[PDB]
Each structure stands twice: as C-alpha cells, then as structure tokens.
Ligand binder design. Structure first.
Ligand SMILES: CCCCCCCC/C=C\CCCCCCCC(=O)O[C@@H](COC(=O)CCCCCCCCCCCCCCC)COP(=O)([O-])OCC[N+](C)(C)C
Ligand SMILES: CCCCCCCC/C=C\CCCCCCCC(=O)O[C@@H](COC(=O)CCCCCCCCCCCCCCC)COP(=O)([O-])OCC[N+](C)(C)C
Ligand SMILES: CC(C)CCC[C@@H](C)[C@H]1CC[C@H]2[C@@H]3CC=C4C[C@@H](OC(=O)CCC(=O)O)CC[C@]4(C)[C@H]3CC[C@]12C
Ligand SMILES: CC(C)CCC[C@@H](C)[C@H]1CC[C@H]2[C@@H]3CC=C4C[C@@H](OC(=O)CCC(=O)O)CC[C@]4(C)[C@H]3CC[C@]12C
Ligand SMILES: CC(C)CCC[C@@H](C)[C@H]1CC[C@H]2[C@@H]3CC=C4C[C@@H](OC(=O)CCC(=O)O)CC[C@]4(C)[C@H]3CC[C@]12C
Ligand SMILES: CC(C)CCC[C@@H](C)[C@H]1CC[C@H]2[C@@H]3CC=C4C[C@@H](OC(=O)CCC(=O)O)CC[C@]4(C)[C@H]3CC[C@]12C
Ligand SMILES: CC(C)CCC[C@@H](C)[C@H]1CC[C@H]2[C@@H]3CC=C4C[C@@H](OC(=O)CCC(=O)O)CC[C@]4(C)[C@H]3CC[C@]12C
Ligand SMILES: CC(C)CCC[C@@H](C)[C@H]1CC[C@H]2[C@@H]3CC=C4C[C@@H](OC(=O)CCC(=O)O)CC[C@]4(C)[C@H]3CC[C@]12C
Ligand SMILES: Clc1ccc(CO[C@@H](Cn2ccnc2)c2ccc(Cl)cc2Cl)cc1
Ligand SMILES: Clc1ccc(CO[C@@H](Cn2ccnc2)c2ccc(Cl)cc2Cl)cc1
Lengths: 609, 609
C-alpha cells in the first residue's frame, strides 16, 4: 500500500530527472552526438545522480544503448566502479544491468575495464519478497544464471566471478536457480554452474553448501515444490546396480531424504511447510517408496496399537462419568420449573462403598492418562513455536487442540472433585464429547476411513463456516420476530419463544428442522406468526440447499484429487511424528546401511523397477 | 410481429415489381441486350420506382451486374444521384450498394460520375435495432469499414469522404467498428481510419469524439464488452517506462477509466449496463489492478467500518423491540381460543419508569438511523430513474429495496407509537427480519462469504421461484382435499385442517416436512386421508428432489465460474458507490498525478510486470 505507493513515485521521479538532465536524456535515446557536445563543453558532472542514484552509464545500460554507453566509458572510466545509491537499487552497478538485459557487447566492454564481478546488489528491489517480481540473487553470476545466459556465465567465471558467493539469505547461485519460474532452464544452468566446481580443495561441494536456514539446494527443491529440479538432483543420488531386460535395480542415497533426527530432513521440511507443491514431492520415486514402506512395516502397527489404547482409555473415562457419585437433593424445589432430582455428593460421601473403589481405579487411570497427554503435547510445542508454529500445526492438524483441551477438562474435573465444587457435569460433558471425537484422529490409519475424514476438515473450516455466519444472521432476525409475536401470548400453550434465549434456541432448531413447527390448533395463534414462519421456512430451505450446492462443487472436481493426496500427506505426517517420539529399538531405521557392502556410512533404499 | 410481417410483404413486393417491369428484370439477370432494346424504343422511364423506391441502377448494384449497370449510367447519369425513397431503405444510393457488395469496378465507375460520398442512408433497415442484422452506420465510409474493404475505404477518402461524419446516433465510423461482430477485422480497420486523422486542425482527434450518449470509442468498447477492441485501444494509453530483463514497468493513462465524478466513467458504465460481456473488461490489465488496489486500500476498510455501524444499529433496534412496552390485558377473553395475555401500553404509560428512558434513547437512535437511510437512498434514486433505472439496479442489487423497506417499517412503527395504534408487532416483525437480513449485504466485503451469497440471489430469483409456483399448485389441490376429508370430522382430535386458511398453512408445512403427519391412533381417521396423504408425500418427495436436481446442474458448471466473476463485479459496484458518496478527503484519488513528473494533468497507474 504505502510502500508500493512510494516505489511508484520514485519510478516516476526517475523518468522526470532523465528528461530534465541533458546528459541522462541523451543516454536514454542513444543520441551519441548529444553525448559529444556536453563533453565538448566541459568535463562536467558525469557524477550526476538521478532519483535512484543513476549515472548516465546506468541509464545507457538500462535502455540497451551500446554506442551511448561507450562515450561515457572513454570520457569517464570510473563510472563502471559506481553503484546506485538509493535504498531501492543499492549496490547495482552497470555490470548487473548489462547482464540482465543480455547485452553481451556491453558486458564484454565492462569486463575490459575491470568491472567488479563481486559487486553486491543489496537493494530492496532485489530481496526475495512477495512485492518483487524477480529474485535474482545479488551477484552478477546470479543475475546471469537467472536470465538463461550460458555465454555470460562463462564470460564472468573466466574473469574471476566466484561461484561460492552467498547472499544476505545465504543462497548461493545453485539455491537461486531453484527459486526460478522457468524450471527447465534452471536444470541446464544447474549443470553448467556445477561443472565449474572442479575444485576439490574448497572443503565442500556446491550442491552441499547450506543457506542461512540450513537448507542445501536438494532440500530447497523439496521445500519449494520444485519437482523438476528435484528429479534432476535425485539422479546424482541414484546408483543403478544392474539391468536385466526390462528390470533395473536402482539404489538410492536416502541421506538428506530420510529423517535422521539430528537435523531437519526432507520429510520433516515438506510436512511443516505452507507450499502446496511441496506435497507433490511425496509422489517422487525415492520418497514414495520410502514412506510407504515405513508405514506398512512399522508406522501402521504402532498407530493401530496406539489407537486401541486410546479406545480403552476413553471407555474407562466414559464409565467413570456414567457412575459419577450422585445423591438425592436436600432442599425443596424453588419453583415448579425446577426439574432437578439428584445432586452430586461431597468428597467424603463419594467413596464409602465397594462400587466407589472400582471407580476410583478408573478415575486415577483417567487422571494419569490426562497428565501424560499434557506431558507429551505441552512441552513439545514449547520447543516449537508456542502459538505461531503451533498454530501452523493446527491448520495441519486440529487434533492437537482437541486432545490438549480434553486433558485440561479432565484435570478441571479433578480439581472440582477435590474442592467439592458444584457443576462437574460441565467439564465432563466437554470431555466426553472431545474425548470421543478424538477417536476419528485414528481414522487416518485405515484406508477406508482416511480420505473420508479429511473432507470433514475441509468442510468445517470451509463451507460450514460460510453457512453458519449467514445462519446466525437469519436466526437473529427470526428469533427476534418470533419473540415479539408471542410476547403478548400465553406461554403455557406454545412455549417455544417464552424468553429470548429460548426463542433464539428454538429458532436454531426450527432452522435445522430438528424440532417441529410450533402449533396448537386449540387456540388462536397470531396471524403474524404464520406469515413469518412461512418466510422463515423458505429462507431456511434456500440456505440449507445453498450449502448443499456449495459443499458439492467444491468437493467433486476441486478437492477430490486433493483429499487423497492429503491423506497420503497425513500418513507421512503421522509417520514422521511416530518415528520422532519412539526410540530406535522400536523403530528400525529405513534402508540398508553401508560399511558391510562397500558403500560407506550411508543408508540405501533399493528399488527394483 | 406486425412490422416484421410488413417487411416480408415489401420484400416480396420488390421481387414482383422486378418481374413485371422489363427494365428492372433486365438489370437483375444482366441481360445487357435487353437493356439496349428498351432504350432503342424511347428514352423511357428510367425513373421507374420499385417497391422500395428502387431504380434499375439500384437493381444492377444489388445483383452484382457490372455490364447491366453501365448501360443505365451512359443513358441516364442522373440515376447515380437518386436514393431509395421508401421508409425501409431511405437515403440508400447505388454507391451504398456497390460498397457493401465490394463491387470495386462498379464503385470506381460511380466515383467517376461524382457519386455523393456524403449520402445518408437513413432508412429503418439501417438503424441499430434488435430487428436489423446489420448496423453499418449510414455513410459509404461507414459501409466500407464494416465489410472489411481496405481498398474502397482508401478510394472514398481520396475522393472526399469525410471521416468526421456522424449518424443519427452520433456514432462516427470509429464507433461503428466497435459494434461489429468480427472484432479482429475491426482492429485493422480501426488503425487505417485512424491513420487518415492527419488533421491537427479539426479541434479533436477521431478517437475522442463522443456520440449522443457521450461515449467515446474507448468507452463504447467497454460498454459493449468488446474486449478485443478494448485491449487494442488501451495500447494507445500505455507508456513503457523501462525494460529490465523480464521486468517491464508500464504506465497507464487512467483518464477515461477512473471515476473522476464529473462525467460517467468506464467503471460506472460497465456496472450499470445489461451486457454480460462488459463484465469481462474488469479483468483487463489497467482495470483489474485499478479496482483491486482501491478496494484493498480504501474500499474494504470503509465497508467493514460501515458494516460495524449497521451491526450496532440493528442490535439497538432489536433491543428496542425486545423491551417494547406491554401491560396485562384489561377485558376478559372473548372465547377459549383467545390466547392473549398482554397488550401494548398507550403512549402515556409507555414512558413512566427509568427503564423506559434508556429505551427511548435507543428508539430515537432507531428513528434517526431510519431517516438517514431515507435521506441517502430516496433522493439519490430520484436523480436516477425513479422506477426503471432504479429497478435496473434492483436486478443488480436487491438490498436497495430491502433497506428502504426497513426504514419505512420503522417510521410506520413510530407513527403507530404516536397515535397509539394497536398492532405494532406487524411493522416491527417485518423490520426485525428485513433489518437483520440486510447484514448479508456486508457478506460481499469478506472473501469467504462473498461468492456464497450471490448464489443465494441466483437461486431465489431462479430455481426457488420455479419451485414455488409448482409448490403452490400442489398445496392448493391437497389442502382442499385435506379440508373436505376432515370437514365432517371432529377437530378436537386432529385440528390441522379445521378451517381453510389453517388447512392451507398445514399443507404448506406438511409439504416442507416441518410439521409431522397428522395422526391420532385413538380414533378412526377417514380412509380417504391415508390415500391422499400417501399421494401427497410422493409428489412432495418428487418436487423437493426435483428442486435439488435443478439447483444443482444450474450451479456447478453453469454459474460457478460466473459467481466468482459476479463477486468481483460486486466489489467494483461497491467501490464505485463508496467513492461516489464519500468526500475526497476520505478517498484519495487513485493513481499518481502528473505536473510534477512532466506528464501533464493526467493521473497514472504504474504496473510492473
Ligand atoms: C458462526 C456464528 C457466530 C455468531 C453467533 C451469534 C448467534 C447468537 C448468539 C448470541 C447472541 C445473543 C446474546 C444475548 C442473548 C440473551 C441475552 C439476554 O439476557 O436477554 C435479554 C436481552 O436480549 C436482547 O435482545 C439483547 C441481545 C440482542 C441480540 C443481538 C446479537 C448480539 C451479537 C451480534 C453478533 C452478530 C453475528 C452475525 C455477524 C454479523 C432480554 O431477554 P429476556 O430474558 O427475554 O428479557 C425480556 C425483557 N423483560 C424482562 C422485560 C421481559
Ligand atoms: C409463488 C406462489 C404465489 C401464489 C400463492 C398462492 C398460494 C395460496 C395463497 C392464497 C390463496 C388462498 C386465498 C383464500 C384463502 C382463505 C379465504 C377464506 O376466507 O376461506 C373461505 C373461501 O375459501 C375458498 O375455498 C376460496 C379460495 C379458493 C382458493 C383458490 C386459489 C385462489 C388464488 C389462485 C392463484 C393460483 C396460484 C398458482 C398459479 C397458477 C372459506 O374458508 P372457511 O373459513 O374454512 O369457510 C368454510 C365455509 N363454512 C363457513 C360454511 C364453514
Ligand atoms: C493411565 C494410562 C495408562 C492411560 C492411557 C493413556 C493413553 C490412552 C494416552 C496417553 C498419551 C496419549 C497420546 C499422546 C499423543 C498423541 C498424539 C496425537 O496427535 C495428534 O492429535 C496430532 C494432530 C494432527 O496431526 O491432526 C494423537 C493422540 C496421541 C497418539 C495420544 C493417544 C493416547 C495416549 C497414548
Ligand atoms: C459438550 C459440547 C458442548 C462440546 C463443545 C463442542 C466443541 C468444543 C467440539 C465438540 C465436537 C468437536 C468436533 C468433533 C470432530 C471434528 C472433526 C475434525 O476433523 C478431522 O477429523 C480432521 C481431518 C482429518 O485429520 O482426517 C476436526 C475437528 C472437529 C470439527 C471437532 C471440533 C470441536 C468440536 C465441535
Ligand atoms: C458454528 C456452529 C458450531 C454453530 C453455528 C451458529 C452458532 C454460533 C449459534 C447459532 C444458534 C446458537 C444457539 C441458539 C440459542 C441458544 C440458547 C442459549 O440459551 C441459554 O443460555 C440456555 C438455553 C436456552 O434457554 O435455550 C444457549 C446457547 C444457544 C444454544 C446457542 C448456541 C450457539 C448457536 C448454535
Ligand atoms: C442514529 C444513527 C447513528 C444510526 C446509525 C445509522 C447507520 C447504521 C445507517 C445510516 C445510513 C446507512 C447506510 C445507507 C446506505 C447504504 C447503502 C446500501 O447499499 C445497498 O444496499 C446497495 C444494494 C446492492 O448493491 O445490493 C447498503 C447499506 C448502507 C451502507 C447503509 C448502512 C447503515 C447506515 C450507515
Ligand atoms: C416478518 C416476515 C413476514 C418478513 C417478510 C419476508 C420478506 C419481506 C423478506 C424476509 C427476508 C427477506 C430475504 C432475506 C435475504 C435475502 C437474500 C438476498 O440475497 C443476497 O444477499 C443477494 C446477493 C449478494 O448481494 O450477495 C436477496 C433478498 C432476500 C431473498 C430477502 C428477500 C425478502 C425477504 C424474503
Ligand atoms: C415464494 C415463497 C416465499 C413462498 C412460496 C409459496 C407462497 C406464495 C405461499 C404457499 C403457501 C402459503 C401459506 C399457506 C397458508 C397460509 C395460511 C394463511 O392463514 C392466515 O391468514 C392465518 C394463519 C392460518 O390460519 O394459517 C396465512 C398465509 C399462509 C401462511 C400462506 C403464506 C404464503 C405461502 C407460503
Ligand atoms: Cl471414527 C473411527 C476411527 C477409527 C476406527 C477404527 O475402526 C476399525 C474398527 N475397529 C477395530 C477395533 N475397534 C473398531 C476399522 C474401521 C474400518 C475398517 Cl475398513 C477397518 C477397521 Cl479395523 C473407527 C472409527
Ligand atoms: Cl451474513 C454475514 C455477513 C457478514 C458477516 C461478517 O462476519 C465477520 C465476522 N464478524 C466480525 C464482527 N462481527 C462478525 C467475518 C466472517 C467471515 C470471515 Cl472469514 C471473517 C469475518 Cl471478520 C457475517 C455474516
């Protein structure tokens, strides 16, 4: 908004300063005879700074004027050593500009005049931002690699441009190629820049240098969803054992792919990222066979065993609420609308029979199981982001909130049982609902229920929320109308709208048609009731069929191919989680280690095809 | 109907008069030896007028007879100065006909005989009508431009045909090209006719001359939805600042596009028009970035702020109806069907406690807010069309009617409160429903609810109306059958159909299944009831599933791509409305003005691409 307005004013201010400067105007439209006469007058301000700190050589490079750029260079060679000075294009020399324009006659002329090939374009328009259309890095090698200029990238390296140079983000030129929109040119420019890594004395290969986030180019291809660069980079990690007719046994390196646990791996990065195209990497041929085999061998048995424990635990909590201690009430009824018969016992009376001691066993099992949930969920999100990266795992998984909220409602029921507080049915009823609805976390391990259950998550976070905002507006209008229509009437015949919170709840139930329409037929109802309830019935039939259309076309050709891809992504997210919190004796590491096969200390996945 | 019948009889009358005239028949089938002998006899009626005022040169031009047309011209040259005289083809000379047929040998022969290139074909078959298949303008330059004849348009201009000539609609030849079905030939014929605007002494360029509606050719391309002519015309208004590799900074003129407020602009014309293809112009690259930036910067905050005020106002009106003054009834009940307990107070008793004065604050806030609605909606539609162009904005927006009807129902409740009239629940109940259902006007500002809420409008104005006409027919048959089946029975057991207005309302509720089927089981019902209610239940299950099919296929591949385009069109209609009624201090004008950048007094939108 405001900064994009400020960029627009500086770009218009650039064009004004070109027109009102006879030096800069001459370089824009290649009037070399105008370049002569301003130098015939005096050896004047070639140190004219424009709006973005332009010099006239920067103007001649931007508008692709060869002959205009020459006259600046013989008259003042020092303008090749000058960068732009403004905050928007800081550090950019005319070497950067001639490379991006692919003006090769100009960039040969600049390298003849020792133009600095290590100049860092550190301006704001060169950062990797949502508000910059290019991210070319900041070195002229990085700018040449992104414009697909195989001649200039050779020309700069043969004049001393360093292929080891990083940016403020730490991205080397191999990282920057992965961030490029034309992914096929990036593969050709990958191999050429990797070919100049002849040096076996630079301590580390170029494809193994991490950026400041600690990602290598291989791992950065997985995070960005760059499936084209991912398949290309993986062929360096293949090793074909044999070829038997149509058969081919291929051996995969599985080093940065597999979750080793010391550093964040390629499986962990893809699960925790916001790119939709990173999920496409899970179907690639090292990663697909890797995570499907550790699911079938070890992930799925340790998930169904972990669901059978949660099922027996939630039956144990359920029985402790069915058999909760209750005694007949003491006082008399305050009013004839008082429905209550029983009340909960105090702590002294709650354990005075042998049936109360079998319950006390299950209540302690419930308390312990709720603490263990808080011992494994509450600390392990503090080492992550407390609310933000936790909340980014809520859009990935809502069952983080639901089982923490379950375990809190249980310990609230414990504290209310200790201090003998009235109203234990409130935290119990939240916990029975939350604790049972957490069983459909375990629907993802079953191939029948798994894809069905993600479609729940898409429609609660989507279309059912769109419906409920417009439902609550219609309810607030009609519950208020139904309240005042029956505000004069006797409530002993038709009590649906007797006060305003019940009128509001009756209209919600009439909207969903889960209670019948109010009718007596023995008494006269207001005529305004039938007019209003007819209009209410049409608007509800409109909305509840609008939802059924909206839930439809969003979920047949839009997310039906996505729900099965997100089910396979939940298998990976479940397996990465179960491998992380279980010890190595329970989880044998995937692949086959070397060192007894001559392959090293790396772990290999053999895929026969 | 009648006039299309009259056109058909004149076209058959033309062919009869050709056959029974030996002059006109000879020119139709190119019998030049028959043309000789009628002139050998006498210098006879070459002034023969046919049915549409044809002469024989008009016949020879219509049937593409070169050699037949020559014999008319040497024998009588004055027939090139004659137009057709009938009302259907008035003004049409043989110059018009030879141009439309692209008979270039004939039109060179006519221009050799000083044929009038400024002749106005003002006949009814040349007007822009739904009942004419061509709109070619009315000058021979306009006819040449529409048949794609680049040779004849040069030939007429080099004989003196004026490119500044307008029609009865005021359309110059550049306007007429935009109205043409082959839009790609129109772009080539645009540039050629714009090339002959060498004259810098004709006070105004050809692309800047308005028609009688005040539209220029650029604005007429937006109104007609001519997206091909729109992109072509916009390239005259671009200005490329620089080109940096793949980047390009383009500067857009934004003069006739942006709502300046003095004259109707291109954004205002497209919103208020009935063409569906004009909505395609909103996705074009000056217009899309313009209206998305003024929505995100200024349109959406002033719309959510304006919805938060309407939400607090409608809660204030709601509480003033919940706490409406009511007293216990005075008289005794007229009958045991009288349900009423309370009645509304008179004006004297209505304000006699401190709780009635807090309500009086909110009641005055309600009265003032209803007048302000009538001060900003009722005058500003009178300056528009009172009912017609107002009603054309009802098919655009139904919330014009709904918030005017709300504000009327509030002031009716005020007048009923003043004169102390019984029955204030009737205008209150309409106003609670209307006032709350106007909150989903503000669903369009939210990207989640916006596309959902237009699908409400498509289905109430569409499929739910188709259902309700056929519902009311089925209800009127079965409520009448259910009335007479229980007409003999005792109503104290089953009172659903006790009189005819309740039988009609019960059948409506039984149709929508919002009340249960009438049953007693303690008494014998008529056997005709079970037969009828079974047939009623099948026909309702037929219809309510027919609707669910009809609401489906009309709204998945038919309007699902249209509902999102109509949501973006509502953003534009909301933004044009909010810019129009808010002052310039609240709304900073979009773009960047010139005059401090050497660009003039125009306002420019920079788009980097
Ligand atoms: C996904 C959806 C989420 C939203 C859920 C919201 C759904 C609704 C949930 C909650 C809303 C209701 C809360 C209060 C209800 C009871 C309060 C009460 O005690 O009653 C008192 C006040 O009664 C009133 O009339 C004041 C409340 C006006 C309702 C306006 C909505 C407020 C929120 C707007 C939000 C906009 C939402 C739409 C967005 C634009 C009076 O009632 P009584 O006891 O009968 O006394 C009669 C007087 N007598 C004593 C003289 C006899
Ligand atoms: C989107 C849909 C829009 C249309 C909505 C329409 C839906 C319906 C809405 C309104 C229609 C009903 C209006 C009158 C109802 C009550 C009148 C009354 O006082 O009752 C009296 C007359 O009762 C009758 O039988 C006469 C009315 C016959 C109904 C024919 C339809 C009229 C409109 C056709 C339009 C066609 C529509 C389809 C298009 C082709 C008698 O009733 P009673 O009190 O029981 O007295 C018993 C006699 N006793 C005293 C001897 C005991
Ligand atoms: C007295 C004792 C024996 C009671 C028994 C306790 C178990 C039934 C509890 C204790 C810890 C629980 C586990 C703690 C952590 C998790 C992770 C949790 O993961 C998510 O919900 C992730 C969210 C998402 O990705 O959607 C699923 C339940 C599970 C396996 C829990 C399953 C039930 C467990 C084993
Ligand atoms: C005692 C009552 C008042 C409890 C209060 C209601 C809410 C606190 C709870 C009750 C049931 C819960 C829901 C039960 C089931 C689901 C489905 C669940 O969807 C999935 O299974 C995710 C997709 C997948 O992993 O396959 C998302 C959470 C949600 C909506 C839960 C959200 C929180 C809810 C509404
Ligand atoms: C997003 C989904 C889960 C719900 C969609 C709308 C809800 C936010 C609203 C709409 C109608 C509301 C209900 C309508 C009115 C009432 C009565 C209200 O009254 C009371 O406090 C006591 C019970 C009574 O008197 O009815 C209690 C909340 C409740 C059930 C409301 C709970 C919240 C609801 C479901
Ligand atoms: C005592 C006072 C402070 C009461 C508060 C009054 C406001 C709540 C009212 C007064 C004027 C109203 C506005 C008058 C005009 C309009 C235009 C109206 O536009 C349409 O409905 C267009 C129809 C369509 O395009 O569908 C939407 C509501 C709105 C913003 C109204 C919103 C509510 C406002 C600000
Ligand atoms: C007290 C009772 C008897 C009131 C009488 C009923 C009608 C006078 C009112 C009640 C609710 C109104 C409806 C409430 C909501 C809508 C949705 C609305 O659709 C939109 O939101 C338009 C699309 C968009 O702009 O996104 C169109 C009008 C309509 C059908 C209204 C039409 C007029 C209705 C039926
Ligand atoms: C287009 C949508 C909004 C409605 C679809 C059909 C309506 C035009 C008709 C069909 C059935 C009609 C209802 C059926 C019968 C009655 C009873 C009638 O009786 C009375 O006057 C008092 C109440 C009673 O005795 O039932 C009042 C109107 C009402 C509700 C009618 C209102 C108009 C309705 C909804
Ligand atoms: Cl919400 C929900 C989530 C998970 C399950 C597990 O359901 C198990 C059945 N099962 C086994 C022991 N107790 C129940 C199951 C379901 C389907 C198939 Cl095809 C196969 C199996 Cl084994 C059930 C409901
Ligand atoms: Cl019919 C209808 C029309 C408009 C709204 C506005 O709803 C707001 C919520 N809100 C804020 C204050 N009071 C309610 C909202 C809805 C959805 C999303 Cl994604 C985001 C927001 Cl902020 C609600 C119902």
């Amino acid at each position: 908004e405001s900064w994009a307005q400020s960029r627009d004013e500086q770009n218009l201010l650039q064009q004004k300063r070109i027109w009102e400067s006879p030096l800069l105007l001459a370089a824009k439209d290649n009037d070399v005879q105008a370049l002569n006469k301003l130098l015939k007058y005096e050896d004047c301000k070639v140190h004219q700074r424009g709006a973005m700190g332009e010099t006239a050589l920067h103007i001649a490079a931007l508008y692709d004027n060869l002959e205009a750029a020459m006259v600046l260079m013989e008259a003042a060679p020092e303008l090749v050593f000058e960068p732009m000075t403004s905050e928007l294009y800081e550090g950019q020399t005319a070497l950067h500009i001639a490379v991006v324009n692919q003006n090769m006659n100009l960039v040969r002329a600049l390298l003849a005049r020792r133009a600095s090939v290590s100049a860092r374009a550190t301006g704001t328009a060169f950062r990797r931002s949502p508000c910059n259309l290019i991210y070319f890095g900041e070195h002229p090698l990085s700018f040449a690699a992104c414009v697909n200029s195989e001649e200039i990238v050779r020309l700069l390296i043969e004049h001393g441009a360093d292929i080891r140079a990083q940016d403020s983000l730490g991205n080397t030129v191999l990282h920057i190629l992965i961030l490029q929109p034309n992914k096929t040119f990036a593969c050709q420019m990958y191999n050429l820049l990797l070919s100049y890594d002849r040096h076996g004395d630079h301590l580390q290969p170029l494809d193994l240098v991490p950026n400041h986030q600690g990602l290598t180019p291989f791992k950065l291809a997985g995070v960005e969803g760059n499936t084209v660069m991912f398949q290309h980079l993986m062929q360096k990690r293949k090793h074909t054992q044999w070829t038997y007719g149509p058969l081919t046994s291929t051996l995969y390196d599985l080093t940065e792919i597999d979750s080793s646990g010391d550093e964040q791996s390629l499986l962990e990065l893809i699960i925790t990222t916001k790119k939709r195209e990173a999920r496409q990497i899970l179907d690639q041929t090292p990663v697909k066979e890797l995570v499907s085999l550790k699911w079938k061998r070890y992930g799925r048995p340790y998930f169904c065993m972990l669901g059978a424990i949660y099922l027996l635990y939630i039956i144990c909590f359920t029985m402790c609420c069915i058999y909760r201690p209750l005694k007949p009430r003491t006082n008399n009824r305050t009013s004839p609308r008082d429905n209550t018969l029983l009340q909960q016992k105090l702590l002294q009376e709650a354990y005075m029979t042998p049936k109360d001691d079998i319950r006390l066993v299950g209540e302690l099992v419930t308390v312990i199981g709720a603490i263990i949930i808080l011992l494994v969920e509450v600390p392990d999100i503090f080492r992550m982001g407390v609310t933000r990266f936790f909340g980014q795992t809520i859009l990935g998984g809502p069952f983080h909130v639901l089982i923490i909220t379950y375990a809190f409602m249980v310990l609230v029921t414990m504290v209310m049982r200790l201090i003998s507080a009235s109203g234990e049915v409130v935290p119990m009823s939240f916990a029975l609902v939350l604790g049972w609805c957490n069983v459909m976390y375990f629907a993802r391990g079953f191939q029948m229920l798994g894809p069905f259950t993600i479609m729940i998550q898409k429609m609660i976070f989507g279309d059912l929320m769109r419906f409920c905002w417009l439902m609550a507006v219609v309810i607030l209008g009609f519950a208020s109308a139904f309240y005042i229509i029956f505000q004069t009437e006797d409530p002993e015949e038709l009590g649906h709208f007797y006060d305003y919170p019940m009128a509001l709840f009756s209209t919600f139930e009439l909207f969903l048609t889960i209670i019948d329409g109010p009718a007596n037929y023995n008494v006269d109802l207001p005529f305004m009731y039938s007019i209003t309830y007819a209009a209410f019935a049409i608007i509800a039939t409109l909305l509840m069929l609008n939802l059924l259309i909206a839930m439809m076309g969003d979920t047949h050709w839009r997310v039906a191919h996505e729900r099965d891809e997100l089910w396979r992504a939940q298998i990976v997210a479940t397996t990465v989680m179960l491998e992380r919190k279980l010890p190595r004796c329970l989880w044998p590491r995937s692949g086959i280690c070397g060192r007894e096969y001559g392959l090293g200390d790396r772990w290999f996945l053999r895929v026969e095809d």
